[PDB]
């Protein structure tokens, strides 16, 4: 969200019966009211003065920044012939530059839904067409495709593809159709389903997701399953492992500070040492407090400074000090803090190196990181393992399932 420099613009009522403007937004959507369309008439008058994407900050000196939609339309409707706007351009925040899946430029949700309907109803199901489309669309575009498909067929898209697709391909495609928060929410529910817990999957998602992502996950989890994510974590975890997971899942880690606190970096490094290697036993609450509350750039420097006081680095210290699920959680969290692309590169390698494939981890990472940092993951993977992630997917998977994953990868390295 980039707000441009403020500007004043005068608009005049037209004899057609209005200002020739269209607006969206408002305080209810927690984004300011923005100009969405300028008429043919008004554009000739306002060439270079007002633009689509301009947020309306003031109307005739009245601040409408924190006003909801109808409040703004009532002011402009109950206004005079001329109106003076204070405006500012809203350049929407860009996505990641390091994702493999980009948004298709000439995107037609109706044409995509039609082509998918044709592929689904082709005798034998045209999987290639389905994979080609959905792996070359952004997640948001797939949501538009799903809405258009349901109107066209009276059938939900994910429901249709669950019967048209089978095996691991179905798992990939159904995974791509969910929003990021829905996918993680449903993967978390799956890790806590029935008796026992897939702690590895719970650890992977909770340790790796950011504050904003965990915020949306906690909301979407409660909407889907009518229970709080924290309550299911409490019922499926125990001891200090539970406390760490509950702390992380809140998504209230300190945001990246502007200044580097070298004194706190040193004190956190010593407290981490004093709580573990330097003593008998471990002060696990101290470890949890520092590693869940401090910002990520800070902890990165804390872990390096820690090596000045400790004979072992943070990861080796964790292995020596704690065991079981608690150890595994700490090990994943520190990797995610130190180098998250490398973390995922190693988990991808682990899921393919040996007999068969841990498809659950492979599919989840290729889906969830395709629009985040897949290009960095690929870079770290080729750097460490000498062959591309593309290569390993080829040797471990086959068929349309393989082609789907290769598309989410994005190419060879």
């Amino acid at each position: 969200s980039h707000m441009g420099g403020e500007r004043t613009v005068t608009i005049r009522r037209q004899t057609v019966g209005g200002f020739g403007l269209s607006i969206k937004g408002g305080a209810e959507h927690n984004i300011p009211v923005v100009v969405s369309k300028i008429s043919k008439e008004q554009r000739a008058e306002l060439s270079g003065l007002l633009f689509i994407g301009d947020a309306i900050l003031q109307i005739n000196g009245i601040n409408v920044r924190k006003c909801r939609h109808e409040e703004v339309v009532q002011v402009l409707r109950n206004a005079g012939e001329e109106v003076t706007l204070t405006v500012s351009f809203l350049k929407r925040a860009p996505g990641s530059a390091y994702g493999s899946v980009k948004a298709y430029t000439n995107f037609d949700a109706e044409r995509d839904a039609l082509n998918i309907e044709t592929a689904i109803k082709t005798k034998g199901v045209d999987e290639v067409t389905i994979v080609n489309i959905l792996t070359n669309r952004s997640n948001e575009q797939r949501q538009d495709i799903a809405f258009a498909y349901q109107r066209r067929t009276k059938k939900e898209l994910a429901s249709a593809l669950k019967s048209a697709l089978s095996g691991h391909l179905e798992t990939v495609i159904l995974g791509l159709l969910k929003t990021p928060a829905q996918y993680d929410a449903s993967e978390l529910k799956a890790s806590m389903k029935g008796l026992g817990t897939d702690e590895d999957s719970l650890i992977e998602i909770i340790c790796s997701r950011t504050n904003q992502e965990l915020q949306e996950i906690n909301r979407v989890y409660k909407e889907m399953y009518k229970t709080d994510l924290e309550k299911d974590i409490i019922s499926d975890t125990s001891g200090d492992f539970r406390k760490l997971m509950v702390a992380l899942a809140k998504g209230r880690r300190a945001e990246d500070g502007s200044v580097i606190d070298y004194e706190l970096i040193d004190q956190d490094a010593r407290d981490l040492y004093d709580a573990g290697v330097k003593r008998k036993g471990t002060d696990v609450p101290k470890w949890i407090s520092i590693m869940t509350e401090r910002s990520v750039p800070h902890l990165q420097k804390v872990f390096d400074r820690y090596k000045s006081y400790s004979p072992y680095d943070m990861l080796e210290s964790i292995r020596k000090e704690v065991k079981g699920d608690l150890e595994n959680a700490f090990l994943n969290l520190v990797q995610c803090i130190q180098n998250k692309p490398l973390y995922f590169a190693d988990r991808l390698y682990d899921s393919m190196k040996g007999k068969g494939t841990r498809d659950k981890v492979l599919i989840r990472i290729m889906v969830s990181r395709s629009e985040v940092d897949m290009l960095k993951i690929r870079s770290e993977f080729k750097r460490k393992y000498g062959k591309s992630l593309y290569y390993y997917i080829q040797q471990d998977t086959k068929g349309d399932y393989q082609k789907a994953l290769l598309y989410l990868c994005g190419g060879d390295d």
């Binding site: 209005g18 607006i23 969206k24 339309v73």
Partner: peptide
């Protein structure tokens, strides 16, 4: 994007 759009 594609939010409620009042035209004035």
């Amino acid at each position: 994007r594609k939010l409620p759009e009042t035209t004035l």
